[PDB]
Each structure stands twice: as C-alpha cells, then as structure tokens.
Amino acid sequence: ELSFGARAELPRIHPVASKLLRLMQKKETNLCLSADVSLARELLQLADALGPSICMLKTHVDILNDFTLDVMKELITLAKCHEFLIFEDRKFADIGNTVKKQYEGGIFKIASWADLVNAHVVPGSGVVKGLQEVGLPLHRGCLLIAEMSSTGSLATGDYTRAAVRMAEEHSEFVVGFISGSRVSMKPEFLHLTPGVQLEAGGDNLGQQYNSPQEVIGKRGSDIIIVGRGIISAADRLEAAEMYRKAAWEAYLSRLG
Amino acid sequence: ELSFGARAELPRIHPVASKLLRLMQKKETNLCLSADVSLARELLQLADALGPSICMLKTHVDILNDFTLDVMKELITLAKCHEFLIFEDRKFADIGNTVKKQYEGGIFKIASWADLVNAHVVPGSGVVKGLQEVGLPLHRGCLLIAEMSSTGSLATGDYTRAAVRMAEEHSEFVVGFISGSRVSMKPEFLHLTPGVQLEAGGDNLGQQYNSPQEVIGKRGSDIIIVGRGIISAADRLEAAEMYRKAAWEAYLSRLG
Numbered sequence: 409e410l411s412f413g414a415r416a417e418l419p420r421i422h423p424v425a426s427k428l429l430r431l432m433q434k435k436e437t438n439l440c441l442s443a444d445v446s447l448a449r450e451l452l453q454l455a456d457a458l459g460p461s462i463c464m465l466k467t468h469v470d471i472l473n474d475f476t477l478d479v480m481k482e483l484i485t486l487a488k489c490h491e492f493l494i495f496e497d498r499k500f501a502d503i504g505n506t507v508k509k510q511y512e513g514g515i516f517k518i519a520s521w522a523d524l525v526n527a528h529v530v531p532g533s534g535v536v537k538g539l540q541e542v543g544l545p546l547h548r549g550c551l552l553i554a555e556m557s558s559t560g561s562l563a564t565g566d567y568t569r570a571a572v573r574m575a576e577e578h579s580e581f582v583v584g585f586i587s588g589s590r591v592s593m594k595p596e597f598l599h600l601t602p603g604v605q606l607e608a609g610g611d612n613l614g615q616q617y618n619s620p621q622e623v624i625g626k627r628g629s630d631i632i633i634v635g636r637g638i639i640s641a642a643d644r645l646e647a648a649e650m651y652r653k654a655a656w657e658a659y660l661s662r663l664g
Numbered sequence: 665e666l667s668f669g670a671r672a673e674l675p676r677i678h679p680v681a682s683k684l685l686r687l688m689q690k691k692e693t694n695l696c697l698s699a700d701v702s703l704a705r706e707l708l709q710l711a712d713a714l715g716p717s718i719c720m721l722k723t724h725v726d727i728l729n730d731f732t733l734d735v736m737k738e739l740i741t742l743a744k745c746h747e748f749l750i751f752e753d754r755k756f757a758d759i760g761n762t763v764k765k766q767y768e769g770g771i772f773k774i775a776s777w778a779d780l781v782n783a784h785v786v787p788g789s790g791v792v793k794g795l796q797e798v799g800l801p802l803h804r805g806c807l808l809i810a811e812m813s814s815t816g817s818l819a820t821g822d823y824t825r826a827a828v829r830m831a832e833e834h835s836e837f838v839v840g841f842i843s844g845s846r847v848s849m850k851p852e853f854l855h856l857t858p859g860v861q862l863e864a865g866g867d868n869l870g871q872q873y874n875s876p877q878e879v880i881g882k883r884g885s886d887i888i889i890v891g892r893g894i895i896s897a898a899d900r901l902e903a904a905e906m907y908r909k910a911a912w913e914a915y916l917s918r919l920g
C-alpha cells in the first residue's frame with residue numbers, strides 16, 4: 409500500500425495521474441466535488457470557495473444553461489490557483505470515430521479544458537482509441553467506467569474485467585476507473601467512487617450511497633465523488649471539510 | 665411479417681412509432697441519414713436535399729460547431745415539410761437525475777426538438793426512468809441500445825437480453841432498439857441498425873459495416889442508419905437514393 413506521494417513517482421505513472429497524486433498529497437484531500445449546478449456563476453462560486461478542499465471538480469457542461477468557453481477559461485484559472493484538476497463527466501460511449509469529434513469539437517471543445525474525461529467501455533476499445541487521438545497531444549487522461557453506483561447496473565462481472573483489460577492496453581491515456589471499489593491491483597491506476605455520503609441509503613432515481621470510510625478505508629478506492637452531500641448542505645465549506653477529513657483519514661488508516 | 669403500414673396500427677404501438685411507420689410506408693424509405701457534419705449550413709442543406717429520401721435524420725448536436733436553437737428550429741421545419749423524424753443520438757448513459765437535465769436543459773434542450781433519443785442500458789432502468797419523466801409529456805420516444813456495431817462491443821448476450829426486458833417494462837416511452845438485428849419478436853418495436861454500407865469493411869477506429877441487404881433482408885432489422893456511406897459521396901442525393909432503394913427493396917423481399 410503506497411502513499412499518494414509515492415504513487416506520483418511510479419516509473420509507469422501517467423503525468424496527469426502524477427499531477428493529481430502530488431496535489432492530493434500536498435493538500436491532504438482525496439475529495440472530488442460533483443459540481444452539479446445549472447448556472448455558470450454557481451459553478452465558478454463553488455470552484456472558488458471549495459477549491460482549497462478538493463483535488464478535483466467534476467462538471468456536466470451539458471447541463472449548464474449558460475455555458476461559454478469563457479466560463480471554462482475562468483474555471484481553469486480557479487483550478488490553477490487552488491490546484492485541482494477538472495473532470496468533465498461526459499461518459500463517452502459511441503464508436504471511436506464519433507467520440508473523437510465529441511471530445512475535440514462542437515460547442516463545448518471539452519478537450520480544450522478538461523484534464524480528465526470518462527468513458528463507458530460497452531463500445532469496445534475503439535471508444536478509447538478515438539478519444540486518445542485527441543487527448544494525448546493535449547496531455548489529457550481518461551477514466552473508464554468499470555462499475556456503476558446505480559441500481560440495476562450491468563457493469564459487473566466480465567464487463568468490469570473488460571474495462572480493466574482495456575485500461576491496461578491503453579495506459580498512455582487511461583489513468584484509472586470510475587468504480588465502487590478497487591478493481592486493479594496496479595497502483596499506477598486511480599479509482600474514483602461516486603455514490604458517497606456520510607449517512608446510509610439513499611436512492612431516489614436509482615443512486616445508492618456508501619460512506620467515505622467504507623469506500624476508501626474498506627473497499628480500497630482513492631477518491632470520493634460527492635455532489636448533493638455537499639451542495640445541498642447549509643454550509644458548503646463545512647460540508648466539503650467533513651467529507652475531505654473523512655476520506656483523508658480513511659486513506660491514512662489504510663496505510664496503517 | 666407485417667408491412668410498415670400495418671405495424672403502424674398495432675394497438676400496443678407508440679404514436680411516435682406510428683407516425684414514423686406511416687411515413688416510411690408512404691415515402692417508401694426505411695433509411696435514416698446520420699448527418700455527421702460540423703456546420704449548420706451543411707446539416708440543413710443535407711436535411712432539405714435528402715428530406716424526400718429518408719424516414720429519419722439522426723444528429724450529433726454536440727459535434728455541430730455553430731449549434732444554436734435557431735438551427736434546430738430550421739431543422740424542425742424541414743422535418744415537417746419533408747416528413748421525417750429527428751433522432752438525437754445522444755446515448756444517454758448516466759444515473760436518472762442526471763440524464764433528465766441532459767435531455768431537457770443545458771444549451772442544447774434536446775427534448776424540445778428531437779422526436780427520438782436513445783440510451784445505453786448499462787446504468788439500469790434509472791436511465792429510462794429519468795428520460796421518460798421529460799419525454800412522456802412531450803410525446804417523445806426513446807430507443808434502447810441493445811447491440812453495437814463496433815469491434816469489441818460488450819453489448820452481447822445477457823446485456824442485450826437486459827435491454828429487451830427494459831424496453832418491455834418501459835414500453836410507453838421506448839419505441840424500439842439500436843441493434844445489429846431483430847432482438848425482439850414484438851412487431852410494435854422498431855429496430856434501427858447503424859454500421860451499414862453497400863461495401864463490406866470498417867473504419868480505422870473499430871466501426872464494422874454490413875450491407876443493407878444483410879441487415880434488413882437477412883437480419884430482419886427495420887431501418888438502416890448510414891453516415892459516411894452517404895455523406896462522403898460527391899453527390900449525397902444520389903447516394904441517399906442508392907441506400908433507400910437498397911434498404912426498401914430488401915424490406916419488400918423479406919415480405920415475400
């Protein structure tokens with residue numbers, strides 16, 4: 409079990425994973441904020457206020473009512489100032505020829521500003537191969553969806569194993585997984601886990617929740633992704649701090 | 665085998681599926697153009713020129729460099745003048761609360777203009793449940809992705825069967841499937857098949873092509889989806905007519 413700091417130095421580490429690991433160590437945070445908001449001013453207010461507490465901000469640019477590239481330019485200034493990576497949760501899941509265009513072009517120009525994106529593995533490795541053509545020149549990384557937090561998820565068994573294999577065969581671009589627990593023993597790969605809250609439960613339209621101690625300390629994941637557990641709290645600063653301390657202490661416990 | 669006209673009257677038949685089947689009958693076309701272009705001017709010129717040859721125009725709004733809602737308003741007008749449905753190939757693939765905002769809101773407001781959208785089934789029925797909450801009041805329909813055309817597709821076997829059962833359980837919203845062949849015996853469901861060209865082959869990023877005669881005649885799908893086979897030809901109108909004749913003649917042949 410290596411520290412984040414030491415994994416940032418592994419000979420085979422991807423530069424983006426290495427950059428994320430060094431900043432998680434420096435800032436003592438393994439918390440990704442799911443910035444699930446509809447206005448650009450909310451997204452920038454949250455990134456500025458909660459930046460110090462997080463290693464990563466996860467966006468859904470396609471839910472922003474007033475997206476412009478100038479919003480993303482301002483987000484990058486905040487990511488650079490407070491030191492976190494930007495993860496656009498686009499869940500690419502088309503053939504390689506189409507995802508390449510969806511990643512580089514259209515109105516969002518996602519590769520122009522997202523350090524990380526994710527993809528489903530259901531199309532086969534072409535999905536990774538098309539993204540890579542755009543993301544490698546721009547020094548970008550991708551996470552593959554190995555498992556899902558939601559009820560009825562088909563991302564189990566042989567499907568998870570295919571995501572892991574795909575990741576090993578594309579490690580110049582794939583830096584880890586979205587998953588509910590550690591799915592690879594290779595320490596170069598990051599594991600990010602959504603469906604996290606301090607309290608048990610907690611469905612609604614299919615989502616399921618586990619605590620930071622369970623997913624970090626017991627299930628061996630690296631980073632927790634939290635949206636509503638922070639964003640719906642009265643005091644989002646205190647809430648972000650609670651999740652950061654929970655996830656950081658669970659990670660320390662695991663190192664022994 | 666029922667004709668398209670007759671299927672338009674199955675009792676169990678969605679009104680969107682009915683509208684589509686009647687216009688396929690009337691126009692003698694079971695061709696969906698995949699309008700994979702990056703400029704509004706080209707998208708709308710193809711929509712107008714090829715409108716008479718197709719039953720459906722399939723978009724990737726997120727690759728359109730000069731997207732505005734005014735462009736989609738013009739597309740609706742051509743869909744009404746020429747009679748074809750608009751299918752946004754967004755491959756929704758997220759938890760329920762997320763996909764509902766991806767469908768209704770953001771800059772694209774997909775539900776406001778797209779007759780049809782599609783979704784992956786990997787997250788479980790939560791994906792359909794989120795879209796359906798938006799789509800039912802707006803009298804929209806959805807396709808589920810039961811199979812994929814690309815090398816390495818994990819949409820096979822139990823996965824595909826999971827997709828069919830999900831469509832059965834959400835039949836007031838789900839109008840059929842994206843798949844390589846007939847996956848359901850119910851004639852109320854439509855089957856639309858991408859990965860189609862007159863020539864055997866593939867691209868350099870995992871796309872595989874089969875002929876109209878193979879997919880409509882032998883595999884018993886309903887509609888061919890064709891992008892490059894048409895968009896790359898010098899005369900896209902001639903090309904769309906070749907594909908329309910081929911798919912329609914193949915449909916006649918399966919009817920005896």
Ligand SMILES: O=c1nc(NO)ccn1[C@@H]1O[C@H](COP(=O)(O)O)[C@@H](O)[C@H]1O
Pocket residue numbers: 442444466468497553555556557558586602603604615633634635636637758759762
């Ligand atoms: O990163 C993810 N990986 C997923 N695969 O399981 C699924 C959802 N997500 C996103 O993680 C966020 C979790 O939010 P809540 O903590 O339930 O409010 C949402 O924006 C989801 O769309």
Ligand SMILES: O=c1nc(NO)ccn1[C@@H]1O[C@H](COP(=O)(O)O)[C@@H](O)[C@H]1O
Pocket residue numbers: 502503506698700724753811812813814842858859860871889890891892893
């Ligand atoms: O190729 C696909 N395969 C699918 N499943 O295999 C689903 C949709 N598509 C879309 O179908 C179109 C096929 O394009 P070509 O016909 O391969 O240019 C593209 O826009 C793809 O994104």
Ligand SMILES: [Cl-]
Pocket residue numbers: 420421422425579580581582583584596597
């Ligand atoms: Cl890597």
Ligand SMILES: [Cl-]
Pocket residue numbers: 532533534537815869870
């Ligand atoms: Cl491939």
